[PDB]
Design an enzyme around this catalytic site. Structure first.
Site, PDB file in Angstrom:
ATOM      1  N   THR A 265      23.814 -14.337 -81.510  1.00  0.00           N
ATOM      2  CA  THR A 265      22.494 -14.720 -82.033  1.00  0.00           C
ATOM      3  C   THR A 265      21.589 -15.282 -80.953  1.00  0.00           C
ATOM      4  OG1 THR A 265      23.545 -16.823 -82.587  1.00  0.00           O
ATOM      5  CG2 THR A 265      23.153 -15.225 -84.358  1.00  0.00           C
ATOM      6  N   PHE A 390      18.995 -22.120 -88.453  1.00  0.00           N
ATOM      7  CA  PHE A 390      20.309 -22.678 -88.124  1.00  0.00           C
ATOM      8  C   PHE A 390      21.112 -23.135 -89.359  1.00  0.00           C
ATOM      9  CE2 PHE A 390      17.916 -23.175 -84.088  1.00  0.00           C
ATOM     10  CZ  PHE A 390      18.756 -22.414 -83.272  1.00  0.00           C
ATOM     11  N   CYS A 397      24.281 -25.037 -88.175  1.00  0.00           N
ATOM     12  CA  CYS A 397      24.800 -24.588 -86.861  1.00  0.00           C
ATOM     13  C   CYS A 397      25.210 -25.700 -85.980  1.00  0.00           C
ATOM     14  CB  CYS A 397      23.747 -23.768 -86.105  1.00  0.00           C
ATOM     15  SG  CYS A 397      24.387 -23.090 -84.538  1.00  0.00           S
TER      16      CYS A 397
HETATM   17  C1  HEM Z   1      19.900 -18.853 -81.867  1.00  0.00           C
HETATM   18  C2  HEM Z   1      21.177 -19.043 -81.972  1.00  0.00           C
HETATM   19  C3  HEM Z   1      21.920 -19.286 -83.227  1.00  0.00           C
HETATM   20  C4  HEM Z   1      21.595 -19.112 -84.521  1.00  0.00           C
HETATM   21  C5  HEM Z   1      20.344 -18.451 -85.029  1.00  0.00           C
HETATM   22  C6  HEM Z   1      22.652 -19.586 -85.280  1.00  0.00           C
HETATM   23  C7  HEM Z   1      22.685 -19.549 -86.696  1.00  0.00           C
HETATM   24  C8  HEM Z   1      23.643 -20.143 -87.452  1.00  0.00           C
HETATM   25  C9  HEM Z   1      23.650 -20.236 -88.868  1.00  0.00           C
HETATM   26  C10 HEM Z   1      22.541 -19.690 -89.735  1.00  0.00           C
HETATM   27  C11 HEM Z   1      24.787 -20.931 -89.222  1.00  0.00           C
HETATM   28  C12 HEM Z   1      25.228 -21.322 -90.650  1.00  0.00           C
HETATM   29  C13 HEM Z   1      26.135 -20.241 -91.277  1.00  0.00           C
HETATM   30  C14 HEM Z   1      26.283 -20.285 -92.796  1.00  0.00           C
HETATM   31  O1  HEM Z   1      25.536 -21.001 -93.513  1.00  0.00           O
HETATM   32  O2  HEM Z   1      27.157 -19.528 -93.346  1.00  0.00           O
HETATM   33  C15 HEM Z   1      25.471 -21.246 -87.986  1.00  0.00           C
HETATM   34  C16 HEM Z   1      26.634 -21.881 -87.923  1.00  0.00           C
HETATM   35  C17 HEM Z   1      27.368 -22.047 -86.780  1.00  0.00           C
HETATM   36  N1  HEM Z   1      27.002 -21.712 -85.502  1.00  0.00           N
HETATM   37 FE1  HEM Z   1      25.336 -20.956 -85.015  1.00  0.00          FE
HETATM   38  N2  HEM Z   1      23.590 -20.069 -84.475  1.00  0.00           N
HETATM   39  C18 HEM Z   1      23.262 -19.902 -83.223  1.00  0.00           C
HETATM   40  C19 HEM Z   1      23.907 -20.311 -82.069  1.00  0.00           C
HETATM   41  C20 HEM Z   1      25.193 -20.837 -81.978  1.00  0.00           C
HETATM   42  C21 HEM Z   1      25.874 -21.255 -80.809  1.00  0.00           C
HETATM   43  C22 HEM Z   1      25.295 -21.173 -79.419  1.00  0.00           C
HETATM   44  C23 HEM Z   1      27.149 -21.679 -81.206  1.00  0.00           C
HETATM   45  C24 HEM Z   1      28.277 -22.255 -80.427  1.00  0.00           C
HETATM   46  C25 HEM Z   1      28.093 -22.693 -79.180  1.00  0.00           C
HETATM   47  C26 HEM Z   1      27.179 -21.532 -82.625  1.00  0.00           C
HETATM   48  C27 HEM Z   1      28.240 -21.898 -83.401  1.00  0.00           C
HETATM   49  C28 HEM Z   1      28.093 -21.974 -84.768  1.00  0.00           C
HETATM   50  C29 HEM Z   1      29.183 -22.538 -85.575  1.00  0.00           C
HETATM   51  C30 HEM Z   1      30.537 -23.000 -85.063  1.00  0.00           C
HETATM   52  C31 HEM Z   1      28.723 -22.588 -86.861  1.00  0.00           C
HETATM   53  C32 HEM Z   1      29.512 -23.095 -88.113  1.00  0.00           C
HETATM   54  C33 HEM Z   1      29.126 -24.558 -88.381  1.00  0.00           C
HETATM   55  C34 HEM Z   1      30.076 -25.202 -89.407  1.00  0.00           C
HETATM   56  O3  HEM Z   1      30.053 -24.793 -90.562  1.00  0.00           O
HETATM   57  O4  HEM Z   1      30.903 -26.107 -89.148  1.00  0.00           O
HETATM   58  N3  HEM Z   1      25.979 -21.022 -83.040  1.00  0.00           N
HETATM   59  N4  HEM Z   1      24.774 -20.750 -86.922  1.00  0.00           N
HETATM   60  C1  LIG Z   2      27.610 -12.943 -87.519  1.00  0.00           C
HETATM   61  C2  LIG Z   2      28.118 -14.368 -87.247  1.00  0.00           C
HETATM   62  C3  LIG Z   2      29.604 -14.423 -87.578  1.00  0.00           C
HETATM   63  C4  LIG Z   2      29.843 -14.380 -89.105  1.00  0.00           C
HETATM   64  C5  LIG Z   2      28.858 -15.151 -90.050  1.00  0.00           C
HETATM   65  C6  LIG Z   2      27.396 -15.075 -89.576  1.00  0.00           C
HETATM   66  C7  LIG Z   2      26.439 -15.900 -90.439  1.00  0.00           C
HETATM   67  C8  LIG Z   2      26.956 -16.394 -91.800  1.00  0.00           C
HETATM   68  C9  LIG Z   2      28.142 -15.662 -92.381  1.00  0.00           C
HETATM   69  C10 LIG Z   2      28.434 -15.816 -93.682  1.00  0.00           C
HETATM   70  C11 LIG Z   2      29.654 -15.238 -94.297  1.00  0.00           C
HETATM   71  O1  LIG Z   2      29.874 -15.389 -95.483  1.00  0.00           O
HETATM   72  C12 LIG Z   2      30.642 -14.463 -93.470  1.00  0.00           C
HETATM   73  C13 LIG Z   2      30.449 -14.909 -92.027  1.00  0.00           C
HETATM   74  C14 LIG Z   2      28.999 -14.770 -91.539  1.00  0.00           C
HETATM   75  C15 LIG Z   2      28.422 -13.378 -91.820  1.00  0.00           C
HETATM   76  C16 LIG Z   2      27.441 -15.467 -88.090  1.00  0.00           C
HETATM   77  C17 LIG Z   2      26.163 -15.867 -87.377  1.00  0.00           C
HETATM   78  C18 LIG Z   2      26.431 -15.492 -85.918  1.00  0.00           C
HETATM   79  C19 LIG Z   2      27.738 -14.684 -85.800  1.00  0.00           C
HETATM   80  O2  LIG Z   2      27.604 -13.493 -84.975  1.00  0.00           O
END
Ligand code: HEM
Ligand SMILES: C[C@]12CC[C@H]3[C@@H](CCC4=CC(=O)CC[C@@]43C)[C@@H]1CC[C@@H]2O
Ligand SMILES: C[C@]12CC[C@H]3[C@@H](CCC4=CC(=O)CC[C@@]43C)[C@@H]1CC[C@@H]2O
Ligand SMILES: [Cl-]
Length: 454
Positions: A265, A390, A397
């Site tokens: 992303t 995020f 995130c």
């Molecule tokens: C522009 C960059 C990024 C976007 C747009 C983005 C977007 C998101 C979104 C929308 C979620 C929530 C998922 C859900 O509700 O199912 C999420 C969760 C997460 N992202 Fe990102 N993300 C980005 C960058 C990153 C980076 C750089 C990392 C790690 C270094 C990362 C690690 C994670 C992790 C581990 C979660 C799960 C959080 C949790 O539930 O404990 N992401 N991200």
């Molecule tokens: C695609 C993704 C891994 C899987 C994630 C996706 C956003 C949220 C999500 C919801 C789900 O129910 C399955 C996992 C997925 C689909 C994540 C955001 C960045 C990463 O590449």
């Protein structure tokens, strides 16, 4: 009141409507036609798609709704296990991992990551300084090189060396081949022996990903230098609420989870940002004047990156228009009523359509399609739950700051060192996997011949 719903196809329901390479963009058109909420149903599942800040704000009340993992996508859960993105909030390893890894995204963590982010950013700039006059940049490709390498190095003290390869790293190729294979099987006679080689290849791809993870851990056990990075915390960090560190099984899932989510992303974001800049010369010029004003040294310091205010607005505005993980899912914890009109039973699934949320004229005004970073001029004026690239609340995130610091640093250095030309007058073509990226976006970069420190 009946909830809107696009047309059904026998007992395939709405599923034929997603017979497309660009389902999120198709869903945005339906959202345009049917409004803030609509039901969408397939053979094995049903959900409701929300597009208005007014409904999404309710959906984001954690007392009423929690994070849902969609059943249709269990192949993801299969592969990422109970890693942080694919675990349920109620699962034990969610909270444990969350508390153990949060300090890896602290202000003191980011300062510690900065020099290694610079190492990969200097590589990107140098690649582009070394292009001959006849050549151009493959933008998402090179942003994916940068982002994968940056999470590898900063997170795990491992060098993918993506700028030493002409094609994507084998990990990426296997990642993309695995996650494509898994997604194609959703509409497979899947057990047909005609698909045996597809299953053997899928196995080979997981084995590349697994060998890499093993090497990362083994390199670390053997290491002579002192690291205090994301992997250090995964291995040694202890859950305050109970005093234990993660087990080996869960750690492996976190590694794969962070390698992938920690790059994809962010590469999309950088690619869309550069797209919007070159289509909006006045914005590019303003972002460039900032870069030149702030980045006065041969390499950027952590503090200087924090001063690239307008570059940060550029990035937020790119995430407004094309949030690169464009949807998240929620379920109802108990029976409840949404928006005072739509009753929901316990366990019922909602989907937040982020790009459409981000075009809510109620919130943003009528010019939602214009690229205007000045909207974020004053960020406390944006209503709550209006801007969610995020995600939400405790399941938001974890890497958000890492992503924005990397992106701002890199974009700042790019705008210091080069003038960019949309030499093909590129027409936006958005490819969809589980994320969004411009496909085939190319530019030329004319060096300003500004030397680059070490
Ligand atoms: C522009 C960059 C990024 C976007 C747009 C983005 C977007 C998101 C979104 C929308 C979620 C929530 C998922 C859900 O509700 O199912 C999420 C969760 C997460 N992202 Fe990102 N993300 C980005 C960058 C990153 C980076 C750089 C990392 C790690 C270094 C990362 C690690 C994670 C992790 C581990 C979660 C799960 C959080 C949790 O539930 O404990 N992401 N991200
Ligand atoms: C695609 C993704 C891994 C899987 C994630 C996706 C956003 C949220 C999500 C919801 C789900 O129910 C399955 C996992 C997925 C689909 C994540 C955001 C960045 C990463 O590449
Ligand atoms: C939006 C999304 C891509 C499109 C997916 C969507 C879940 C519902 C769905 C089921 C499919 O089988 C393909 C298309 C879609 C519509 C995914 C949830 C996370 C991912 O980013
Ligand atoms: Cl610089």
């Amino acid at each position: 009141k009946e909830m809107p719903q696009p047309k059904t196809f026998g007992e395939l329901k709405n599923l034929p409507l997603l017979n497309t390479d660009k389902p999120v963009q198709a869903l945005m058109k339906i959202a345009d036609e049917l409004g803030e909420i609509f039901k969408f149903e397939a053979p094995g599942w049903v959900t409701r798609w929300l597009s208005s800040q007014r409904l999404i704000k309710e959906a984001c009340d954690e007392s009423r709704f929690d994070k849902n993992l969609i059943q249709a996508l269990k192949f993801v859960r299969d592969f990422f296990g109970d890693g942080l993105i694919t675990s349920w909030t109620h699962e034990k390893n969610w909270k444990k991992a969350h508390n153990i890894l949060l300090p890896s995204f602290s202000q003191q963590a980011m300062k510690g990551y900065h020099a290694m982010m610079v190492d990969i950013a200097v590589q990107l700039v140098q690649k582009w300084e070394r292009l001959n006059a006849d050549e151009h940049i493959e933008v998402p490709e090179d942003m994916t090189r940068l982002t994968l390498d940056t999470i590898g190095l900063c997170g795990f003290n491992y060098r993918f060396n993506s700028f030493y390869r002409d094609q994507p790293h084998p990990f990426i190729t296997s990642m993309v081949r695995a996650c494509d294979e898994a997604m194609n099987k959703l509409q497979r006679n899947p057990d047909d022996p005609a698909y045996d080689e597809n299953k053997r290849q899928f196995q080979e791809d997981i084995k590349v990903m697994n060998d890499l993870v093993d090497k990362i851990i083994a390199d670390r056990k053997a290491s002579g230098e002192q690291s205090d990075d994301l992997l250090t915390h995964m291995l040694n960090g202890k859950d305050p609420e109970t005093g234990e560190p993660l087990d080996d099984e869960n750690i492996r899932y976190q590694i794969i989870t962070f390698l992938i989510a920690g790059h994809e992303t962010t590469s999309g974001l950088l690619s869309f940002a550069l797209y919007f800049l070159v289509k909006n010369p006045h914005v590019l010029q303003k972002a460039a004047e900032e870069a030149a004003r702030v980045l006065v040294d041969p390499v950027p310091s952590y503090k200087q990156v924090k001063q690239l205010k307008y570059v940060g607005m550029v990035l937020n505005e790119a995430l407004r228009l094309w949030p690169t993980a464009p949807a998240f899912s929620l379920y109802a914890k108990e029976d409840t009523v949404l928006g005072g009109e739509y009753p929901l039973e316990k366990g019922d699934e909602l989907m937040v359509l982020i790009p459409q949320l981000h075009r809510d004229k109620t919130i943003w005004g009528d010019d939602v399609e214009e690229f205007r970073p000045e909207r974020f001029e004053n960020p406390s004026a944006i209503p709550q739950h209006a801007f969610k690239p995020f995600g939400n609340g405790q399941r938001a995130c974890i890497g958000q700051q890492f992503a924005l610091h990397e992106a701002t640093l890199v974009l700042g250095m790019m705008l210091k060192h080069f003038d960019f030309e949309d030499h093909t007058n590129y027409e936006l073509d958005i490819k969809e996997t589980l994320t969004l990226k411009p496909e085939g976006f190319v530019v030329k970069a004319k060096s300003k011949k500004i030397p680059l420190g070490g």
